[PDB]
């Protein structure tokens, strides 16, 4: 009738069809052409060393048993046909928890052409491992990978290819950036062979080059250390006899610095080494705690309890009014040129 001509085409395609066997099981290798359309590169979790990515993962392969001759060259079908045909067992090697979306229907695509060439697109949100080396935190850059390949079929059975040029086979969408801490610099693909206990498997790598934007850790920690050190520098311009004022000055600057040291290591994991921000934290601790030792030396070397023989201005404070701000100022030009410039 009207759609009976296509019904007897689909029922002829699926008659005597075994979806347990790959196309050309005993005669050839089932090549799979792959491209990824990244619709949103999601947030990167520093604490869990992971990242999120929403894709339009496409696979294409040739099936010799799905050839038809009809009034339509392409059969743009729904997803019930996809479960009744052979589809490759592509899985993500460094994935942690991925979701194939199915609201309101399963987000899949299936387009058989008249010679058997298939196209299989899916919506996935892949949470993948991005191992990080945070020795230059927060002025660091990472290359978060995304490896995928077959699970059961080895290199002699199913090989994977990019359908376009490899520089153009991973396309990130224009608005596809849910990144608020990093910014994506560019994608980078590679293809290789990985060996396991079962056999050798073709793996397709996609590296996403990320760079952290220091916009937050300035206002958050760097500038409170600068204001805490420059705060603890003006205690030398106070009176020599003023013991409670400079005493509470030193102890409150030490408390603000030692609570900056605690809050500094949050939302990044408990790594064994020390970051660049931790070295900065150590120096803005040293240049606060060295002021109070100077004040203790002055208080040991001071005399009468008023400001008759009046007291004299300390020589220790006059050098510390000049040496301590410049030894801070030389350090910041050394620290920021070492890490931020390279």
């Amino acid at each position, epitope marked *: 009738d009207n759609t009976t001509v296509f019904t007897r085409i689909l029922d002829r395609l699926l008659d005597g069809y075994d979806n347990r066997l790959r196309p050309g099981l005993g005669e050839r290798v089932t090549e799979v052409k792959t491209d990824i359309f990244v619709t949103s590169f999601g947030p990167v979790s520093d604490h869990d060393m992971e990242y999120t990515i929403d894709v339009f993962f496409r696979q294409s392969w*040739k099936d010799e048993r799905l050839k038809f001759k009809g009034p339509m060259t392409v059969l743009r079908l729904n997803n019930l046909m996809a479960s009744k045909i052979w589809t490759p067992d592509t899985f993500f090697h460094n994935g942690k928890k991925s979701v194939a979306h199915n609201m309101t229907m399963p987000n899949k695509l299936l387009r058989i052409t008249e*010679d058997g*060439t298939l196209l299989y697109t899916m919506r996935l949100t892949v949470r993948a491992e991005c191992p990080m080396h945070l020795e230059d935190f927060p002025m660091d850059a990472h290359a978060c990978p995304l490896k995928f390949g077959s699970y059961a079929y080895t290199r002699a059975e199913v*090989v994977y*290819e*990019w359908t376009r*040029e*490899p*520089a153009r086979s991973v396309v990130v969408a224009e608005d596809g950036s849910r990144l608020n801490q990093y910014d994506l610099l560019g994608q*980078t*693909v*590679d*293809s*290789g062979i990985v060996q396991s206990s079962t056999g050798e498997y073709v793996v397709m790598t996609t590296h996403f080059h990320l760079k952290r934007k220091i916009g937050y850790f300035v206002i958050q920690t760097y500038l409170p250390c600068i204001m805490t050190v420059i705060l603890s520098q003006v205690s030398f311009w106070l009176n020599r006899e003023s013991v409670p004022a400079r005493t509470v000055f030193g102890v409150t600057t030490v408390l603000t610095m030692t609570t900056l040291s605690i809050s500094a290591r949050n939302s990044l994991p408990k790594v064994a080494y020390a970051t660049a921000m931790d070295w900065f934290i150590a120096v803005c601790y040293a240049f606060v705690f060295s002021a109070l030792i100077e004040f203790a030396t002055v208080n040991y070397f001071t005399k009468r309890g008023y400001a008759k023989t009046f007291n004299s201005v300390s020589k220790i404070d006059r050098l510390s009014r000049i040496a301590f701000p410049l030894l801070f100022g030389i350090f910041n030009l050394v620290y920021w040129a070492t890490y931020l410039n390279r």
Partner: antibody, heavy 116, light 105 residues
């Protein structure tokens, strides 16, 4: 499994020449078809790209305009169109099948063009 | 574009020793280079695909090697019938080629 090209061509400069190669043993709808230029005592220069299942073509920016690539399905054949031939276009041309891991597997025997 | 800068122009050694080539890439091509031989009056034949993958019919003496940017092709005990010209390509982007390394006695 065999890529058979046309014969040698000798035309005057400024004219146009049709150049072709027929692919056998497979179908050109699967793999990409590449064109490449080999000057005498020089290296290879890639001409352009064509996707016969799609019709999409991509060209070298130094070869844009003066050359275009066409194809057809029934004859399983790729074609070259060359316009405004000069002295530096005197070279030998090959058509390349895209193979395993984008490697230019098969090559034609080579058609050499000559201007005078 | 991607510029292939394979060196040197020609190597002149005898038969029965190890000879290596080199191909430097301007930008990243990741294990997508290829090596072809060019006999006089002959179409090119593929030798290595990927970075170091021996094609069918290639003898075992032809051992390539690859990386992200630096590439090389090592020949062990080169014979007299290998006296041809060698080309270096890439296909990570739109394909380019090198100048060409020849062999001499």
């Amino acid at each position: 499994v065999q890529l058979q090209q046309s014969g040698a061509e000798l035309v005057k400069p400024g004219a146009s020449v049709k150049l072709s190669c027929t692919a056998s043993g497979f179908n050109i709808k699967d793999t990409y078809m590449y064109w490449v230029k080999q000057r005498p005592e020089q290296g290879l220069e890639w001409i352009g790209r064509i996707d016969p299942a799609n019709g999409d073509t991509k060209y070298d920016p130094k070869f844009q305009g003066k050359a275009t690539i066409t194809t057809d399905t029934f004859s399983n054949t790729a074609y070259l169109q060359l316009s405004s031939l000069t002295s530096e276009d005197t070279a030998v041309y090959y058509c390349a099948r895209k193979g395993l891991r984008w490697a230019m597997d098969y090559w034609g025997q080579g058609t050499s063009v000559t201007v005078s | 574009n991607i510029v292939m800068t394979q060196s040197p122009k020609s190597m002149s050694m005898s038969v029965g020793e190890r000879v290596t080539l080199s191909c430097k890439a301007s930008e990243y091509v990741g294990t997508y280079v290829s090596w072809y031989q060019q006999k006089p009056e002959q179409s090119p034949k593929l030798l290595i695909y990927g970075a170091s993958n021996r094609y069918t019919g290639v003898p075992d003496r032809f051992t390539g090697s690859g990386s992200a940017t630096d590439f090389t092709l090592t020949i062990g005990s080169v014979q007299a019938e290998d006296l041809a010209d060698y080309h270096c390509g890439q296909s990570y982007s739109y394909p380019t080629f090198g100048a060409g390394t020849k062999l001499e006695l």
